[PDB]
Structures are given as C-alpha cells and as structure tokens.
Coordinates of C-alpha atoms in Angstrom, one line a residue:
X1 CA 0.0 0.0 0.0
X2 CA 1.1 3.7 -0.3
X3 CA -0.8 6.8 1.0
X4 CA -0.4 10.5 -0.1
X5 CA -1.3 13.8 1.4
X6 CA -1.0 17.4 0.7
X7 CA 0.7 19.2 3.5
X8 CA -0.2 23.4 3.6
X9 CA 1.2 26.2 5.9
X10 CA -0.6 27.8 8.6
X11 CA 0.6 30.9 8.0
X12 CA 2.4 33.5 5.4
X13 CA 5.8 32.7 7.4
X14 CA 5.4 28.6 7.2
X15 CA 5.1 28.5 11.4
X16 CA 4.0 25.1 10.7
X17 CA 2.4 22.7 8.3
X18 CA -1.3 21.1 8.4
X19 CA -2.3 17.8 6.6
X20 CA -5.7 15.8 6.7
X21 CA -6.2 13.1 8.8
X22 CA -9.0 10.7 8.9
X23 CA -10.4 9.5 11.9
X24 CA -13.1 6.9 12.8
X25 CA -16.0 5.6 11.6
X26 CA -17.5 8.1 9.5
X27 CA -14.3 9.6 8.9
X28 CA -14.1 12.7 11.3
X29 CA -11.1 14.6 9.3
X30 CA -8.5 16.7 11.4
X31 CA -6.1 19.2 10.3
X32 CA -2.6 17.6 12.4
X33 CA 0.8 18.7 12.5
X34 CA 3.1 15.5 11.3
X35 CA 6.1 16.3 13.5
X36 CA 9.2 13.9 12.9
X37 CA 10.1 15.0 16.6
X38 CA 7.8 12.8 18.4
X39 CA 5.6 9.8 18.6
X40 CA 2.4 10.4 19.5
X41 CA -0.7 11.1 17.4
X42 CA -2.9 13.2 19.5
X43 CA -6.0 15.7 18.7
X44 CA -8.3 18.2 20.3
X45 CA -11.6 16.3 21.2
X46 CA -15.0 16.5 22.4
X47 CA -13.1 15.7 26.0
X48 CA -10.9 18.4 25.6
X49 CA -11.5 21.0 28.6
X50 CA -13.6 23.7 27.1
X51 CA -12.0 26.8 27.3
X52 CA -9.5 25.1 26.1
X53 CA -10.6 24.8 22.8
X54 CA -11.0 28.1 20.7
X55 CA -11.8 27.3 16.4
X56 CA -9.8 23.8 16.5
X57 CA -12.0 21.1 14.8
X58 CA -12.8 18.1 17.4
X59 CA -12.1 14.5 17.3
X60 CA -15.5 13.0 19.1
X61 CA -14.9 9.3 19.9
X62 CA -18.7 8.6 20.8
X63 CA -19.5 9.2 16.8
X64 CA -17.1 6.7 15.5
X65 CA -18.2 2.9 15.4
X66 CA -14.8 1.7 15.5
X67 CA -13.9 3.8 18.6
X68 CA -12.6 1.9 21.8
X69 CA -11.3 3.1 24.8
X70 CA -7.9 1.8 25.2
X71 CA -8.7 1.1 29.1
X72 CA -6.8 2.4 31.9
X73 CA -4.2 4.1 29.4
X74 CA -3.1 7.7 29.8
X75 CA -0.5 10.0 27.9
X76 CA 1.1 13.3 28.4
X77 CA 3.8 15.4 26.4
X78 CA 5.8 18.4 27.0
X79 CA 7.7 20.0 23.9
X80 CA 11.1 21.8 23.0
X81 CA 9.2 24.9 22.9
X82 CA 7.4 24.5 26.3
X83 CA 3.9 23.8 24.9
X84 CA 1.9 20.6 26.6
X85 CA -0.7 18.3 26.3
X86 CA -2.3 15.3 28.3
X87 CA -5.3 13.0 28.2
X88 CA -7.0 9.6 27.6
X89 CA -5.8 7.3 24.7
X90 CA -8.8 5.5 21.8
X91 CA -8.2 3.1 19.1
X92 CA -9.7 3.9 15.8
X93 CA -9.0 3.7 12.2
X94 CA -6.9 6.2 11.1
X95 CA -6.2 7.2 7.1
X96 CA -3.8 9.8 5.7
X97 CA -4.2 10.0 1.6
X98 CA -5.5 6.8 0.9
X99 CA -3.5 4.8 3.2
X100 CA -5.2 3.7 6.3
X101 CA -4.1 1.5 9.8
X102 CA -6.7 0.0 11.8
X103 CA -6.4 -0.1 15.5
X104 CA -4.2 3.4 15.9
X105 CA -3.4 4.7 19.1
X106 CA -5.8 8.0 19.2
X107 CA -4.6 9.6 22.0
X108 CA -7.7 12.6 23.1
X109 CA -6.6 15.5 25.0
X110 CA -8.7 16.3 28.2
X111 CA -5.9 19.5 28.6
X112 CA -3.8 21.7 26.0
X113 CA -1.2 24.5 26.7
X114 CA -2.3 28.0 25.9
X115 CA 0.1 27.7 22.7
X116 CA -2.4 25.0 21.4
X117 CA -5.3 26.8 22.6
X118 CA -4.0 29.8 20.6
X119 CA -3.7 28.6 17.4
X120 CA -7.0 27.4 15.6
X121 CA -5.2 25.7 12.4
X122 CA -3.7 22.7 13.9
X123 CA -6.2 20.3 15.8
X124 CA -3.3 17.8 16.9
X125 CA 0.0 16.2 16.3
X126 CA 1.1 12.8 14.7
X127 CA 4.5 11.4 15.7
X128 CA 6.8 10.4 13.0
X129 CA 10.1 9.6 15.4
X130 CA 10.4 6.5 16.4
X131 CA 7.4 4.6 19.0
X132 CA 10.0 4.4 22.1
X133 CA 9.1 8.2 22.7
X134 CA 5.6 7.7 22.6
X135 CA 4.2 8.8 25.8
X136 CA 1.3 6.4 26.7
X137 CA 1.4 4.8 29.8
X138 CA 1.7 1.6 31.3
X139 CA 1.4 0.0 27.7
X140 CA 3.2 2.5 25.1
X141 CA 1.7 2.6 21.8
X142 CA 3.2 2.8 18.2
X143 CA 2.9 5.4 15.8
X144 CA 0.6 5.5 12.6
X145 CA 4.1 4.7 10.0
X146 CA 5.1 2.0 12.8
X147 CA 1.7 0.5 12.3
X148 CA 1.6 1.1 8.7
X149 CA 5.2 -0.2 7.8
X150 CA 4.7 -3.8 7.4
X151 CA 1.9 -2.8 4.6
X152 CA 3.9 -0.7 2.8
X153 CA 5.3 -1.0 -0.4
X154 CA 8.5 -0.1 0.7
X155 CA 9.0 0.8 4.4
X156 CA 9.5 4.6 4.0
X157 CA 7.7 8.0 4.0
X158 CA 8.8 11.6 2.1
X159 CA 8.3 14.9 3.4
X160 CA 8.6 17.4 0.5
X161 CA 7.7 20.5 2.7
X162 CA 7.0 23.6 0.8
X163 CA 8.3 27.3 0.8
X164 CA 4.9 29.8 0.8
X165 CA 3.6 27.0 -0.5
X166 CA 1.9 23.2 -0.3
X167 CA 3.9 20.3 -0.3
X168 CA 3.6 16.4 0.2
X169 CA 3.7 13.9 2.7
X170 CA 4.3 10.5 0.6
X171 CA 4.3 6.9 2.4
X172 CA 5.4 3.8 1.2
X173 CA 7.0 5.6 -2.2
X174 CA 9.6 7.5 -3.2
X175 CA 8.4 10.2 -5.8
X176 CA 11.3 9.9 -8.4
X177 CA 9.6 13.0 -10.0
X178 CA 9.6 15.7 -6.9
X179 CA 13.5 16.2 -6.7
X180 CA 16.1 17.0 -8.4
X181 CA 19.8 15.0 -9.3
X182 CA 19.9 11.9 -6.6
X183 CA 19.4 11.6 -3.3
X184 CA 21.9 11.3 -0.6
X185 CA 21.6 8.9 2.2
X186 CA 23.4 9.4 5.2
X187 CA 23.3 7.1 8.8
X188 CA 21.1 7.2 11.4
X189 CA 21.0 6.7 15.1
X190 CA 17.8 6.2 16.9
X191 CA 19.4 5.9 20.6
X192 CA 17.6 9.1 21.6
X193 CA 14.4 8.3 19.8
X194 CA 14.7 10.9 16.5
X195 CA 16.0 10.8 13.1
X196 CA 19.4 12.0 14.3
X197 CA 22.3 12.1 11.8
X198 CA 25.4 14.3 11.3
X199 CA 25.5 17.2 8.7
X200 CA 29.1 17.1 7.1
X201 CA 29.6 20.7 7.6
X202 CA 28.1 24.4 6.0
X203 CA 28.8 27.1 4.1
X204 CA 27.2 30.6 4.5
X205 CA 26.4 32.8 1.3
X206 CA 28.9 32.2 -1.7
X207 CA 31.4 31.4 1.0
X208 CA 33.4 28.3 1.3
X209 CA 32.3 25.2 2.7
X210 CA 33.3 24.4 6.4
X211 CA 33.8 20.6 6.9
X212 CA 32.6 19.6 10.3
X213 CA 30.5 17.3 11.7
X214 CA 27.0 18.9 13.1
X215 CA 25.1 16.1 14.7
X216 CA 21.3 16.9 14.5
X217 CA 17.5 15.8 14.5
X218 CA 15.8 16.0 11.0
X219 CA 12.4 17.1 12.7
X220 CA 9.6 18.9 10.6
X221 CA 7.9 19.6 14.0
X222 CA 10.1 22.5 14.3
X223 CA 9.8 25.5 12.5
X224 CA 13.4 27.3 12.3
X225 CA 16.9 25.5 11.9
X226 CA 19.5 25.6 15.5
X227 CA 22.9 25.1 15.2
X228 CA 25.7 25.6 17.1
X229 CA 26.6 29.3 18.4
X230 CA 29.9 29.4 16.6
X231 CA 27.9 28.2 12.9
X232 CA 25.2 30.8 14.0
X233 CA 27.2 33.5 14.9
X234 CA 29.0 33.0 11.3
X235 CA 25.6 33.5 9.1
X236 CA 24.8 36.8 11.1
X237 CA 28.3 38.2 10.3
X238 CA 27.3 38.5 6.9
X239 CA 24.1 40.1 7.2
X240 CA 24.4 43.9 8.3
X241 CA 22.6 45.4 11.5
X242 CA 22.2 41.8 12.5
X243 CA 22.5 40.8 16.3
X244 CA 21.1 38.4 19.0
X245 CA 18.3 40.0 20.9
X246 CA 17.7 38.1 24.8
X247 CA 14.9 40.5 25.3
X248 CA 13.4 38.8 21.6
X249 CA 15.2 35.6 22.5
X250 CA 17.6 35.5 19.5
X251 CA 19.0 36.9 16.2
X252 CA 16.6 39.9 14.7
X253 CA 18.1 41.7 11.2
X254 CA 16.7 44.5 9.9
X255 CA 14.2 44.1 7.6
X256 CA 15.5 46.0 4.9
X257 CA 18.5 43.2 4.5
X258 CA 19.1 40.9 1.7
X259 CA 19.8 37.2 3.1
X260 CA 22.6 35.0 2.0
X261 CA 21.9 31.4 1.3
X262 CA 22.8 28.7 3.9
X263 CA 24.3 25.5 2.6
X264 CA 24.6 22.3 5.0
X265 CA 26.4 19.1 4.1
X266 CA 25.3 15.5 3.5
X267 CA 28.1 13.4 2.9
X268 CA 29.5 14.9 -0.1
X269 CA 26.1 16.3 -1.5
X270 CA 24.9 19.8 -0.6
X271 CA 21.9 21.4 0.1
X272 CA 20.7 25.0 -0.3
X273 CA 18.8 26.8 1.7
X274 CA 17.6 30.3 0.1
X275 CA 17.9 33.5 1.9
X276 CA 14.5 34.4 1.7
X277 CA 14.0 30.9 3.4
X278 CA 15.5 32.4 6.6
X279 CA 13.2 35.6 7.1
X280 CA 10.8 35.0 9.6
X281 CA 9.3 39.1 9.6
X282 CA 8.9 41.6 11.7
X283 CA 9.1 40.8 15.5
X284 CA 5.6 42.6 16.1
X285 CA 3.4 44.0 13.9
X286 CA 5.0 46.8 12.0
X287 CA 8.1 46.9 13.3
X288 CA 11.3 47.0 11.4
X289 CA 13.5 43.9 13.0
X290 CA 13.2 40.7 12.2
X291 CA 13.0 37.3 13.1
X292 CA 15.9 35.3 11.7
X293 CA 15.0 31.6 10.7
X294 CA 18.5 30.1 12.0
X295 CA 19.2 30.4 15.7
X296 CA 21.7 28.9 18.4
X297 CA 21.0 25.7 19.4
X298 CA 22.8 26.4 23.1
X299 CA 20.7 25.4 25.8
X300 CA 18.8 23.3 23.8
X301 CA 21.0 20.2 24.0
X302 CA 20.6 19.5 20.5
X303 CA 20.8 20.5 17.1
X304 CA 17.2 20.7 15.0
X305 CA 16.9 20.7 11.3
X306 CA 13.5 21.7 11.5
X307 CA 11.2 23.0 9.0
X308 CA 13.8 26.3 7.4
X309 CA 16.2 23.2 6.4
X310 CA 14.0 20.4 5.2
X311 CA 11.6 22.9 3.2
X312 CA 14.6 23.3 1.3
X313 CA 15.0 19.4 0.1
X314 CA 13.1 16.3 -1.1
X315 CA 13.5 14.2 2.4
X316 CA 13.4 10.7 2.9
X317 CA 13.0 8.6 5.9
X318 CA 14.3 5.4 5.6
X319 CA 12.3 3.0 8.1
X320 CA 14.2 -0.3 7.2
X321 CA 15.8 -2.4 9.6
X322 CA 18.6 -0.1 9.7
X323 CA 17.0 3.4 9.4
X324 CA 18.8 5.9 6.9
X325 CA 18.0 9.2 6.3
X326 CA 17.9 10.5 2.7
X327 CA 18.3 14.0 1.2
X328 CA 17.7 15.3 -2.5
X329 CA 17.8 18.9 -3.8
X330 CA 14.5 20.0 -5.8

C-alpha cells in the first residue's frame, strides 16, 4: 500500500504545516501537524476541557463505530518549545491520503497548553520519530508509519515540505519525480528516539564550505533551523545590522536586508537553503526587526533541522531495519 497527502502552511511565514487526517467511523477529518520530533498522534476532542478549545475542529470518539477506549491508558507530552498536552488514549481507524491503519493509538486531550489553545489551524500532532518516545502509559503505543510499515510498499515516508507553499507527505514511495539529481543517504542513530544524523559541515552565502560534523535531529515539527553558536554566529556576520536579541530571545536583522543562502552538508552532497527561506518578519506588527529563521541551538542540547532546512529538500525517511536518512535537492 502507499498513501499520499497534501501538506499546507498555517501561515504567510510557514510557522508550521497542516495535513488531513482521517479518523473513525465516518471519517471525522483533522487538520494535524506530522512532527518527525515525536511519537504520538494526539487531537483536540469532544473531552478536551472547554476553554481550552478556541476554532480547532474536534475528534469525538462517541460518533465513531470503531472507537474503543484503550482502558486504563493515559498519555502526556511536554515539547522543545514549552507547549503541553495530556489526556485519555482510543483506538480507531486512522487514514492519511488513501493509506489507512486499523487499530491506531488515538490519543484525546482532556488539557492543552495556551500555545495549542492559541492557534485554531492545527487540531493535533502525529509522531513520525520513532514509538519508544511515545508517551502512553503503562502499555506504550506505536505510531501510525510503525503501524503502517509492514503494509507498505516499501517501508518509507517523504516529506517534501514547501516554501509559501503546499507540499507532500508521501508513504510507502519515493516520488522519483519531486527532486532534483539523486538523493543522498546518510546514517542514522535512533538511541535518543529521533532521526538523528550528522551534517558534514556548512557554508554561509557564496562562501566556502566548512567541513565539520554537526550532529542533528531531522524534525519537521520544528519551525526554524538551531545550530551551534559558533555556525550561528558566522551566518549573522554576513548580514548587516544583525545581532542576537535576549529581550526577543535571539538573532533579529533588519528588515530591509538581503539574506545569503545557507548551505549544510550531507556526505559529499549539498543542500541550499535560500535567503528568503531564513526571514521569519517583523518581530511585532510593523516593526522593522526581524525574526531570523536560524538560531543557536545552546541550551537546547541539541541541534534541529527543523522545517527552514528540510523545506529546502526532497527528504526521505528510511524505516528499514537499519533506518537511513535521505536528502535530495529540488
């Protein structure tokens, strides 16, 4: 089998991405955040506390025939960016462009974090990184490619994010038409639960390239890319007026700039990530400083190609035996 879905951003800056999901019996279809970052496939519901929910579309298990309680389990995640979420955990059939897995773990918020709350266009989150993260407790559940994989034609999925722009989330296919020259495949540990791998190095602009290993996450749950201080701190440099702001919490440039490119390594392929790709607008409403799309990853703990990076490539994730991540320009 192979599924197939249209992935769209939530706002003029690409803060995040929104595909349709199908859930239960009629299908109820939710708008959900596919986030390479984590494991668990949860939604706004008709549980969720009420003035919790402001404009989200609702997941109501009591309408869906194939809806069971998965008894006595419970679940509850905290993210990078301090947003939370926690509830009660159903079983339903679950579909994503054409492809469908019976018996998913749906897990049904009874409380969201004000940053859910806040934003109407996203209804929930399904996990792409790997099931040990998953947070349901005491029996932890799998996520929907986990479930899916054995079915597949090949045991993969694609996320070909787009730039002010839709894109695609293919599984169980690689689209030989969607990218550009070959794709690079590079290793992959899953020790701490992501698609972790190691960047062989970055260039900045029409500069030369700096070999060094940059071990990272490839997570499309994130919007911007963090790197390390020093690579950070070399970007800026090139852009005048540029500086990192603790009172914005982190690079601003002034709008009036031009951006140079990013380039980031894999293996010996490169991939290029526009300027423009990097401006994330004015810091409030009107103002002339901006929000820079490439930030320090200090204090994190990690590195995060998140959505700035991947937007720029045709990605592949590589669910074999031995996972392997794969890049392609396009």
């Amino acid at each position: 089998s192979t599924g197939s879905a249209t992935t769209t951003p939530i706002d003029s800056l690409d803060d995040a991405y929104i595909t349709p999901v199908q859930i239960g019996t009629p299908a109820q279809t939710l708008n959900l955040d596919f986030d390479t970052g984590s494991s668990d496939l949860w939604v706004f519901s008709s549980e969720t506390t009420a003035s919790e929910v402001d404009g989200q579309t609702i997941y109501t298990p009591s309408k869906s025939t194939t809806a069971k309680l998965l008894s006595g389990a419970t679940w509850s995640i905290s993210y990078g960016d301090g947003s939370s979420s926690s509830g009660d955990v159903y079983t339903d059939t679950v579909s994503v462009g054409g492809l469908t897995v019976t018996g998913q773990a749906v897990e049904s918020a009874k409380k969201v974090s004000s940053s859910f709350t806040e934003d109407s266009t996203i209804d929930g989150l399904l996990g792409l990184a790997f099931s040990t993260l998953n947070t349901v407790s005491p029996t932890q559940q799998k996520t929907f490619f986990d479930n899916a994989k054995a079915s597949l034609d090949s045991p993969v999925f694609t996320a070909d994010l787009g730039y002010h722009a839709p894109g695609t989330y293919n599984f169980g296919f690689i689209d030989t038409t969607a990218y550009t020259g070959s794709i690079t495949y590079t290793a992959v540990s899953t020790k701490q639960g992501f698609w972790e791998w190691t960047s062989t190095g970055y260039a900045v602009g029409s500069g030369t390239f700096k070999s060094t290993s940059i071990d990272g996450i490839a997570d499309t749950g994130t919007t911007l890319l963090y790197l390390p201080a020093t690579v950070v701190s070399a970007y800026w440099a090139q852009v005048s007026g540029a500086k990192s702001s603790s009172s914005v919490g982190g690079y601003v440039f002034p709008c009036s700039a031009t951006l140079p490119s990013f380039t980031f390594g894999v293996g010996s392929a490169r991939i290029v990530i526009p300027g423009d790709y990097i401006d994330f607008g004015p810091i409030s409403t009107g103002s002339s400083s901006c929000f820079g799309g490439i930030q320090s990853s200090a204090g994190i703990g990690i590195n995060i190609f998140g959505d700035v990076a991947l937007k720029a490539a045709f990605v592949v994730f590589n669910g074999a035996t031995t996972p392997t991540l794969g890049f392609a320009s396009k």
